[PDB]
């Protein structure tokens, strides 16, 4: 029984960029107006879907860890990344991103730049 989450049903259906925040052991969409501004107290999962010439979709999954995110948040971000990859039949390539040391590919998803801000959602622990 492949593991499903309601957000998994929305994931990777069209080319684009989707960002979720870990909140209390769940995967919650980030409001699109706030894309690119990451709370240093939180952990996030990011799916970039690209349309390939052959017609198929390419998937890159990144989990981003803020410098003050709690251990439940970073652990859940890692696990939800695995589960979303599995839901995509294993086809996604997974990437760990740490605040201030992100890959150039990840940074490049944000036109107006990758930024950080203070705060974050309360720890589940």
């Amino acid at each position: 029984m492949v593991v499903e989450h309601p957000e998994f049903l929305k994931a990777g259906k069209e080319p684009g960029l989707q960002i979720w925040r870990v909140e209390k052991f769940d995967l919650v969409p980030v409001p699109p107006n706030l894309y690119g501004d990451f709370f240093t107290g939180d952990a996030y999962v990011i799916l970039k879907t690209v349309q390939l010439r052959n017609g198929n979709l390419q998937y890159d999954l990144h989990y981003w860890l803020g410098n003050e995110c709690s251990q439940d948040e970073s652990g859940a971000a890692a696990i939800f990344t695995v589960q979303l990859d599995d839901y995509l039949n294993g086809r996604a390539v997974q990437h760990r991103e740490v605040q201030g040391f992100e890959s150039s590919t990840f940074s490049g998803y944000f036109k107006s730049g990758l930024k950080y801000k203070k705060g974050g959602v309360a720890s589940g622990f």
């Binding site: 860890l65 970073s74 652990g75 939800f80 695995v82 760990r96 589940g124």
Partner: protein, 357 residues
């Protein structure tokens, strides 16, 4: 529908147990069952140790593998009732297992949970995988060293690579026993089971891993500063010198113990080499320590040197020593069993019974 999972991490030396969502196990007790030497039928954990005079003590888990099922069931009963005060038949349960645990073993544990304890749902997790998740990673190699066994476990995009897992029969109890042995140099004759517990605590309090063993032997001989003291239960003081770093040196030089085995640095390297060349950089860059025997001061620094020496010079060696790593298996289980998706991961009792079974 509203129900919190129990998380049980089964070790050779200690059981760690508690409730999903807690940041640490609230129940930690020795994995020991005592039964009358000659006429309960059985006693568990801390209480068994207080009745050693009239009980024969046994360890139901040997090198991470459950090997005495009747006594293991006593441990699980103690866990649910005495420690947690939980009805196992009313909670999902996450149980952990050793890397490379045979499927037949996993099945017996499953049969006991569903048919002895009537658990409504259960999930079995590999210990090293839970530790990696607790560190916020999906790819890396976990070095998990406990009381009875050490494993090196390469994990890629969430899953262990079975062909690359190493088992090493060398862990904390061997180190405790080695310290008991070398303390004879200074006139101590620790040998009883009770004395072993005392020496275990000495080891934990005073030992450390040298950055370079030969250089540490040299420097420690030049003065008495190496010497550090420990207050015994009877109020006497013991002083320990170079035994402080010679004891855990056996992790790197198992010949100290009369073992032919490779040390933990060599084993980690060999485990990485079993994986295809294209993923090794992510393993070398994410060597994650787990378990009580990884708690020695100096371990990260020493492993970094020694693995760097063995590995290709193009690799980027990073040894990660999380401060909570002692119970990172249990913590990873607490996180996993708290997720909104956990209910889709488990096996239900009805499914098991109709499989069947």
């Amino acid at each position: 529908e509203d129900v919190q999972a129990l998380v049980v991490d089964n070790g050779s030396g200690n059981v760690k147990a508690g409730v999903a969502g807690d940041d640490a196990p609230r129940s930690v007790f020795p994995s020991i069952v005592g039964r009358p030497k000659n006429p309960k039928d059985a006693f568990v954990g801390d209480e068994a140790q207080t009745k050693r005079g009239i009980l024969t003590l046994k360890y139901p888990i040997e090198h991470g593998i459950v090997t005495n099922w009747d006594d293991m069931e006593k441990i699980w009963h103690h866990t649910f009732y005495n420690e947690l005060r939980a009805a196992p038949e009313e909670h999902p349960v996450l149980l952990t297992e050793a890397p490379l645990n045979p499927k037949g073993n996993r099945e017996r544990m499953t049969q006991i949970m569903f048919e002895s304890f009537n658990v409504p749902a259960m999930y079995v997790a590999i210990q090293a995988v839970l530790s990696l998740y607790s560190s916020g990673r999906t790819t890396g190699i976990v070095l998990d060293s406990g009381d009875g066994v050490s494993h090196t476990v390469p994990i890629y995009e969430g899953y262990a690579l079975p062909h690359a897992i190493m088992r090493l029969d060398l862990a904390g109890r061997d180190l405790t026993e080695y310290l008991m042995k070398i303390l004879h140099e200074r006139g101590y004759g620790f040998s009883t089971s009770a004395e072993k517990e005392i020496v275990r605590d000495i080891k934990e309090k005073l030992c450390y891993i040298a950055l370079n063993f030969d250089e540490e032997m040299k420097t420690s001989e030049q003065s008495s500063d190496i010497e550090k003291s420990y207050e015994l239960p009877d109020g006497n003081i013991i002083t320990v010198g170079n035994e402080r770093f010679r004891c855990p040196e056996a992790l790197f030089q198992p010949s100290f113990l009369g073992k032919e085995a490779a040390g933990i640095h060599t084993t980690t390297f060999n485990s990485i080499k079993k994986c295809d060349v294209d993923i090794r950089k992510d393993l070398y860059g994410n060597i994650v320590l787990s378990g009580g025997t990884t708690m020695y001061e100096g371990i990260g620094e020493r492993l970094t040197r020694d693995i760097t020496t063995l590995a290709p010079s193009t690799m980027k060696i990073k040894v990660v020593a999380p401060p909570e790593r002692k119970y990172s298996v249990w913590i990873g289980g607490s996180i996993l069993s708290s997720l909104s998706t956990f209910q889709q991961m488990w096996i239900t009792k009805e499914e098991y019974d109709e499989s069947g079974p």
